[PDB]
Amino acid sequence: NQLIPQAYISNFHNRLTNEDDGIPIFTMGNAVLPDLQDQHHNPFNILRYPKIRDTFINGKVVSPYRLSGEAIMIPITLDIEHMGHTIKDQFLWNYNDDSISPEEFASIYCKDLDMTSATLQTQIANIIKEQLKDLENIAATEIMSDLHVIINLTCNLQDRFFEDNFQWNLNDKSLTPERFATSIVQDLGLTREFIPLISQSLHETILKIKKDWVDGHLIQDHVPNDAAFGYLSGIRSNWCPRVEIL
Template structure:
């Protein structure tokens, strides 16, 4: 796995994804007239808004969706980008924090479950490369799984980064208690994770505790078509 130089900074930095590329995770789940479209991908927030419209048109054309989907897709993407951009310019107070990342997803017939620790202070980390390496190591052949894992990682990192701003706001308002993803710092678990530098080097972003490998070993299941059909039916029922 590629190593990345540590981008930790104890001084406040302007809001952005704590990764090498400032890509926003976008998730769509749109239903119109009984037809449903679901997708997840990343988006460059610096792209012009016209790209959103072009993407929506191409998606509707390629997937042969009803024309009404175009507006819904564009609006959903623009809403999520607007939320991301609302944080821009504000300070993130991220120090050297190790945060738990959990993967539990199904893509087509493949189910992947995993858990590891991520150095959120490393602004040179690459979720996409990590996902590609993980899929290669686990012999996952479906090309859609890697991007889905990367999006899941980015969603969790985005939530933590956004909540770092919310926490600062709450502190300034004198509120007690902070909402946010659990961070592992200065705890027994956190110290153990940091000690593992001797195993993985000082430039890595992903850490697995050697003594807990048997607990957090990645799990990959390949479902039958019948099992996939049953899960899809259950999800549709829950959605309704």
């Protein structure tokens, strides 16, 4: 007896719609959690924390949901307003992979939202089947000849807009943009939610520089702007990243 079960709590949609947790999915001691404090092995001591008895009272019981040589990463935006509240996020999509259907993902996605409306699952996947088919041969390029472009990048996350400027060579594939996204968040001290969002807003920036190379075939490799220290010897960098609170 006196033992908590290992499952049957999925108080996540209430925290999706809690309006204090900074979640951009939906719109309509002194620690908060004892993940550094012991409780002397009495489970009543975890009820003193306000975000935990919130999950015990407002919680629910769930049933568990039960279910290629080079990946083509395509960032897929999903913007659907649905009964006042919206659905706003971004995710990459392995276009080379087809192990999960977008309808299977949308039935997975609307279950954690606790919507399961069965027409969001069509409308999410129809947008995904749109944006995969619109970008099916624009992220599979073979860019050579050292384009070495400068990149201004912006990232929108709850009025905490990140901005940087750097010279990117989309000829060597040594630096993963997800790895480049991680090195900013490690050094700036940001949260883990900027690990996908910087990489998802860079792959879209990459396939836009891929776009102008394959659609209009504009090379325009003419002096990526520098500060006369590295590549182009003017007199012998561009900027540094920042998270601007607008």
